C-alpha cells in the first residue's frame, strides 16, 4: 500500500487507545520499601518512563536503590554470583512484607534468570516487576525517553513497533519470541538515527543522581495528517531493515554515532563456540549491544532460526500495513 493507507489504517487501530494513576502505585510499593529499610530509594522505569503514557495492558517496573548506589550515578552494574546473591536477598524480604500487607496478591521471585527480579500480580490490573541494585534499568529507559523527547511524535512508530511484534510471535513475551520490547526500541531508535530524524546522544551523559523518581507525562496527540508521516515511517524502517542493515556484519548500536562491526566487537562465529549466558550458547546472527551491560548481545536469543522468521515477517508487514489492512 501507499504511505497514506498504511498510515490510515495504524491510526484508527489506535483510535480506540487515545483517551498519574501511577503515584498511587508507587506509594503503595513504597510503603513496602520503607517497612525493609527506610533509607531505600524506589526509582521508576520501563515504556511508562521512556513513553511519558501509562498503556493498556501495560505493568510498572520498579528498581530499589541505596542512597550511595544513586550517588554512583554513572556506575555499572556487576554481573557476580556475589552481585546476585545480594539482590536475592533483599528481594526475599520485600517479597515477605509485599505479601503480609496484602494477601489478595500473587507475588513471584523468577530465579530462572540473568536478573534478579520479584513479580506482583494484583489482579485489579495491577502488574509490576521489583528489581533491586541496579542502575542500568532506569539509565536505558532515561536515554530513550532522551530521545523520544527530541521527537514527541516518533512514539507512534515505536509503539505500532511493539504492538506488531507481539501480533507476529516475534516478541519475547510470546512463547518462542526472541526479542524483547526493549530490543525493538533500540532498533527503532537505531533507524530513527540512521536518517537523521534524531540527534545522536552519549550513553554516558545519563546520570541516575539526577533522574526523577517519578517523572511527568508526556502528552501524545493524535496526528493531524491523517497518519501520513506515520506510514512513512513504518514503510521505511522495514525497508532498511531488510534491505540496508548487513546483518552478516553490522550490530546495532547507540554507543555510537555510524556504523558498529561485528569485527570490532569479536562477535563472530568463532565467538559462539566460547559465549555462554544462563548456561547457555549465544549466538551472534542478530546483533543488538546493550548501551550500559558489557559484552551483552540483546539479540542473543536470535537463533539461525529465528533471523529467518525476522526477515519473513519484515516481507510480511510491508503488505498489511503491519498486520491492519
Ligand atoms: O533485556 C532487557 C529487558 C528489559 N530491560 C529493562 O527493563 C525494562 C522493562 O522491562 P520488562 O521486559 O517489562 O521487565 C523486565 C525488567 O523488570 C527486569 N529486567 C530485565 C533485564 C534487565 O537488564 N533489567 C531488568 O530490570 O526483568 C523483567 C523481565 O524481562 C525495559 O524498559 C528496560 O529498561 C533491559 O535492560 N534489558
Ligand atoms: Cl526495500
Ligand atoms: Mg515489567
Known sequence: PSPAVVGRSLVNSFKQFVSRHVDATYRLVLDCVAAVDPLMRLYTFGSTVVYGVHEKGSDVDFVVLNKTDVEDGKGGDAATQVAKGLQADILAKLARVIRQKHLSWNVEEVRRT?????????????????????????????????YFE?????????????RWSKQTGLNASVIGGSITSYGFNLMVVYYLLQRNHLQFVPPSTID????????????????????????????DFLHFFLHEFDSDKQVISLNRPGITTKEELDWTKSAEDFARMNGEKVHYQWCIEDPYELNLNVGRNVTPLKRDFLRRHLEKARDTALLTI
Not at 116 to 145: C, E, H, M, Q, W
Not at 150 to 162: G, H, T, Y
Open 114 to 146: 540473568r536478573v534478579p527480579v520479584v513479580r506482583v500480580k494484583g489482579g485489579g490490573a495491577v502488574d509490576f516487576d521489583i528489581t533491586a541494585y541496579r542502575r542500568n534499568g532506569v539509565r536505558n529507559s532515561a536515554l530513550l525517553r532522551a
Open 150 to 162: 527530541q521527537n514527541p511524535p516518533c512514539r507512534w512508530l515505536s509503539m505500532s513497533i511493539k
Open 208 to 235: 541516575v543522581s539526577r533522574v526523577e523518581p517519578l517523572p511527568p507525562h508526556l502528552p501524545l496527540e493524535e496526528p493531524a495528517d491523517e497518519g501520513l508521516e506515520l506510514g512513512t515511517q513504518v514503510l
